[PDB]
């Protein structure tokens, strides 16, 4: 059964880029609800699967994807942020960003654009395409998780649900995006990247 992970930092640690109330609500209410609903749905799915009830299995798919994807996504998201984050990555990850997007700044432009571009709720991602052996940017709607729906391995996610920024930035999602670069934990993104090449 799934459990809600502790953040790697206190709720106010990402101030002033992401305020404390957002972090507290986002973690203790939104991600919490994902975990609790996922446990409930998984238990129902097992019963349906055991009885061979295919209609029930299919009726449970939206809740499984939404809550299961929210747990996957939020869990990665917390680790992708740090009070000591910002700047640029180094080494092989920086080399690949240059290779695949031209420059770190071009890369930032493209993830920002993919994130700003989500109409409704969703996520922007930097992922790794294992088949092509290179980085790839992708957007996902609602809580659809990157690897389970696209096969890309997630490296850095940007939540652009309104609850991720509205209390502080209101409708101005581009101000949130500008601010979040200040808290990206490139050490974590680097670790995820290197794990794709072993």
């Amino acid at each position: 059964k799934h459990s809600l992970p502790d953040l790697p930092y206190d709720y106010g640690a990402l101030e002033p880029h992401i305020n404390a109330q957002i972090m507290q609500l986002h973690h203790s209410k939104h991600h919490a609800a994902n975990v609790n609903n996922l446990n409930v749905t998984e238990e129902k799915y097992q019963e349906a699967l055991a009885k061979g009830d295919v209609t029930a299995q299919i009726a449970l798919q939206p809740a499984l994807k939404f809550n299961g994807g929210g747990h996957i996504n939020h869990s990665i998201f917390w680790t992708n942020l740090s009070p000591n984050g910002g700047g640029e990555p180094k080494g092989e990850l920086l080399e690949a960003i240059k290779r695949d997007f031209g420059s770190f700044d071009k890369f930032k432009e493209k993830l920002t654009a993919a994130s700003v571009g989500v109409q409704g709720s969703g996520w922007g991602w930097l992922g790794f395409n294992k088949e092509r052996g290179h980085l790839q940017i992708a957007a996902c709607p609602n809580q659809d998780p990157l690897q389970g729906t696209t096969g890309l391995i997630p490296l850095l996610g940007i939540d652009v649900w309104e609850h991720a920024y509205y209390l502080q930035y209101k409708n101005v999602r581009p101000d949130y995006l500008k601010a979040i670069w200040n808290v990206i934990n490139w050490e974590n993104v680097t670790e995820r990247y290197m794990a794709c090449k072993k």
Copy 2:
């Protein structure tokens, strides 16, 4: 283990409205493939469940919905047809059709139009809305099954995938729809309805 159901009649029994070559391919290849693939997918989902691998669970959803849906939908379809079919229903179902659609012929027009209106692959349905306590027509894409995706109880389904008609009617789906009324098993449709008036 799911199994391919036996048909209630021979492959040639619906001639000349649905030819024998279509019935044999439809049942022994298309539905058979949905059953075989569904069994594999359910096995993989049990393993994913046992591991708490939510990514694997979500990645299996399209195959489960497609092949599970195709098993649900084709199994109902076979029972909805008969060499001894055709004509109009009677009793309570007929009275329900007049109550909700005006007349049997108006109903036929509306289910025809929903079936003709599917762009790409899919199904037209006459269903029962338990909340509203009345009949309802709906169309579904690909193999998305009626009850698992809409909550409606399926009473009569019309497969409008090209494999359901193309060998005989080619591009002219309305000719197929006109023909299929001659083989509807209204006795089955009535049993499904009464089991809704449970």
Copy 3:
């Protein structure tokens, strides 16, 4: 050229059910953005259509549906609210609700459930089904408008995008739904209903 309609009341007219900060942001920022983007998208569509550029037309569809949809839906929503609203509708609209949903209370529970049920961004609707001549509840994702995507005529819509409630109710969307019943403009819903007896 589409324009932002004035609200029928001041920004704090719906206190304390929907606060003045939400009303001012919702109207002057969110709906304003829909209007501007719709005007720009329409002009680009016109250009594409004159050149017979089908690719360009299809690339513009997401922006047109989203911003066109947002303009349609927000414009209806302001007219569906009033400082002099709430309670139960008077006249034939209440008789139709009782007929189709059993009672006002059950109707409230069902539209609340459809609105709570939206996963991600979207709208709950009370619509009119002209073909069947009765009321119908439907949910729509993002800004997809009811009539253009389902054919139902909108009577009453509930915006359940997070910007519609988050600053005041945070994650507790059901508290928002409980509150909005106090400001429904049944005179407007009735006008819309009477215009469907057509």
Copy 4:
């Protein structure tokens, strides 16, 4: 005014790989219906635009995408096939295929997989990603066209609607895909590729 392009060859020129009955129906019935529905839908769209009728614009989108996409996709497809085709491309296009997919044979495996993988109606594509400056494989549902929905420039498309193969290969879509390699017009695919780097 859009028009139905003549095929570049006779209906029987792709025998035995794609038979004459399929080519004749596919062009004279399927593509032909797309062209007239496109023209009619474009004229309705002009009227809706002139009136500022946003609901009408949104309600016409499914017909515009389906039939405009069908026109785009089928027009490319006829040019992608040749009685003098088959084999492998040469020059820059082959070098890009090796760079991006490993080898021509791995490319064929990957476009076959994408095309086999479509559940329901749709298309497999080799495209060009202009932002990344490299090749990319993608699948599209129904008649959704590649460039208009994904941004990728189409180079080679494989129709896997059942009407593209069923009369000849019945349910065995993999046997159609094996066969079609024998009639790919690599001269045309090369022309399309080189135009991407102008």
